[PDB]
Design an enzyme around this catalytic site. Structure first.
Site, short mmCIF file in Angstrom:
data_model
loop_
_atom_site.label_atom_id
_atom_site.label_comp_id
_atom_site.label_asym_id
_atom_site.label_seq_id
_atom_site.Cartn_x
_atom_site.Cartn_y
_atom_site.Cartn_z
N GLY A 229 -71.07 -70.88 -84.85
CA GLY A 229 -70.19 -71.58 -84.88
C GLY A 229 -69.12 -71.29 -83.34
N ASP B 45 -61.62 -82.75 -83.88
CA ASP B 45 -62.90 -82.12 -83.71
C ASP B 45 -64.31 -82.46 -84.96
OD1 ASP B 45 -65.23 -78.83 -82.24
OD2 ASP B 45 -65.73 -81.67 -82.40
N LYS C 6 -67.72 -65.86 -91.51
CA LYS C 6 -68.23 -66.59 -90.27
C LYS C 6 -67.86 -65.26 -89.47
CE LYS C 6 -64.66 -69.31 -87.90
NZ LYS C 6 -64.52 -70.91 -87.77
C1 LIG Z 1 -72.69 -74.62 -90.25
N1 LIG Z 1 -71.90 -73.94 -90.77
C2 LIG Z 1 -73.40 -72.75 -90.53
C3 LIG Z 1 -71.42 -73.41 -90.89
S1 LIG Z 1 -70.12 -73.68 -89.84
C4 LIG Z 1 -68.51 -73.02 -90.26
C5 LIG Z 1 -67.62 -73.15 -89.77
N2 LIG Z 1 -65.97 -72.66 -89.34
C6 LIG Z 1 -68.61 -72.82 -91.46
C7 LIG Z 1 -70.33 -73.11 -91.71
C8 LIG Z 1 -70.26 -72.85 -93.71
N3 LIG Z 1 -71.56 -73.80 -93.93
C9 LIG Z 1 -71.81 -73.13 -94.88
N4 LIG Z 1 -72.84 -73.73 -95.82
C10 LIG Z 1 -74.69 -74.43 -94.77
C11 LIG Z 1 -74.16 -74.82 -93.63
C12 LIG Z 1 -75.80 -75.55 -93.50
C13 LIG Z 1 -76.90 -75.03 -93.63
C14 LIG Z 1 -76.50 -74.66 -94.78
O1 LIG Z 1 -78.03 -73.62 -95.47
C15 LIG Z 1 -75.67 -73.85 -95.42
N5 LIG Z 1 -70.65 -73.14 -96.29
C16 LIG Z 1 -70.01 -72.54 -95.52
C17 LIG Z 1 -69.37 -72.62 -94.22
C18 LIG Z 1 -68.14 -71.74 -94.05
C19 LIG Z 1 -67.73 -72.78 -92.43
#
Ligand SMILES: CN(C)c1sc(C#N)c2c1-c1nc(Nc3cccc(O)c3)ncc1CC2
Length: 330
Positions: free
Chosen positions: A26, A139, A44
């Site tokens: 991301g 978005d 991230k």
């Molecule tokens: C989809 N992804 C990886 C992204 S982009 C993203 C942004 N900006 C976030 C996350 C995220 N994801 C998740 N958990 C999650 C998402 C997809 C699959 C999974 O097993 C857990 N928790 C917190 C977050 C924190 C925020």
């Protein structure tokens, strides 16, 4: 033991955040064990210093999410970066760990009308707070809607967010091909996808996107086409042959008539005639969850201290270093 690594890439978040495991992109996003709060968190990795656009996008999200405090919006718990500006090559934003996103859920699960109704309510509940602060997400899409085990929803990724006065094509409003109404369109596209487990407008390019929209809504009227429109885009849509309006019940014959009425009001070509976040929450389809008493709004409109687009690359790196200093030991 030294700095941590995930898939041949440095992920220097230790000693507080350990036991890393890849999730997606991301930059790279991992889950990690927090030794202080004794919970697994989301981290991230952002490497934005090569381009001035990535720096302002990173700074806007940090400033917005630190000010915002709402149950349907992801917050920022911590930020890690180098102790000196010279060594700062990356920014690690630590947030609450969610089980999945709406993109992964719709790719493997069929949703009942009750679950669709609750997800839509939470999206609009969170959007009500965003819009009250005079902020546009720009978005909204299934991958930006995080979900937990108990089906609670949170909106993430405020990089493309701007103050009210580039996005993922499929959920991009026709007027973009600016205002709060672009987010309603995106929520419209998300609702239509929740009802059939597939994107309603899967265009391969900007032209195919418009053709997919016209294929359902029909050829736009004189009032729909009449605006401060692109000369090339106007002439193109005028040259196209007539397209009939496909009734919503023909696309989703299964769907609740109340859900379709709301979808029609959200997927309105004219952004001025499009439904707003409050009237959308007040729609008969969401009466089971509509509660004006438990729908918080921002205290005051959000505003940046300076025009970030005018600041040079060097001053932008200093602002990121300054904004993140609050999370440093001292
Ligand atoms: C989809 N992804 C990886 C992204 S982009 C993203 C942004 N900006 C976030 C996350 C995220 N994801 C998740 N958990 C999650 C998402 C997809 C699959 C999974 O097993 C857990 N928790 C917190 C977050 C924190 C925020």
């Amino acid at each position: 033991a030294g700095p941590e690594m995930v898939r041949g890439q440095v992920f220097d978040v230790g000693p507080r955040y350990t036991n890393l495991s890849y999730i997606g992109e991301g930059g790279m996003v991992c889950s990690a064990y927090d030794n202080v709060n004794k919970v697994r968190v989301a981290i991230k990795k952002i490497s934005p210093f090569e381009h001035q656009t990535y720096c302002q996008r990173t700074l806007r999200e940090i400033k917005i999410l630190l000010r915002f405090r709402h149950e349907n919006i992801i917050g920022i718990n911590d930020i890690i970066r180098a102790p000196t500006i010279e060594q700062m090559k990356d920014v690690y934003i630590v947030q609450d760990l969610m089980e999945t996103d709406l993109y992964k859920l719709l790719k493997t699960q069929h949703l009942s009308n009750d679950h669709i109704c609750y997800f839509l309510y939470q999206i609009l509940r969170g959007l009500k707070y965003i819009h009250s602060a005079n902020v546009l997400h720009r978005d909204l899409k299934p991958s930006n809607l995080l979900l937990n085990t108990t089906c609670d929803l949170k909106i993430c990724d405020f990089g493309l967010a701007r103050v009210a006065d580039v996005a993922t094509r499929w959920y991009r409003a026709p007027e973009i091909m600016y205002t709060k109404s672009i987010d309603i369109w995106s929520v419209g596209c998300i609702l239509a996808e929740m009802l059939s487990n597939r994107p309603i407008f899967p265009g391969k390019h900007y032209l195919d996107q418009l053709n997919h929209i016209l294929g359902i809504l029909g050829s736009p009227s004189q009032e729909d086409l009449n605006c401060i429109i692109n000369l090339k885009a106007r002439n193109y849509l005028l040259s196209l042959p007539h397209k009939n309006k496909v009734p919503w019940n023909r696309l989703f014959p299964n769907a609740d008539s109340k859900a379709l009425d709301l979808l029609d009001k959200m997927l309105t070509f004219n952004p001025h005639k499009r439904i707003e976040v409050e009237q959308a929450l007040a729609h008969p389809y969401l009466e089971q969850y509509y509660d004006p008493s438990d729908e918080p709004i921002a205290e005051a409109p959000f505003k940046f201290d300076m025009e970030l687009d005018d600041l040079p690359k060097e001053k932008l790196k200093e602002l990121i270093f300054e904004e993140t200093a609050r999370f440093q030991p001292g």
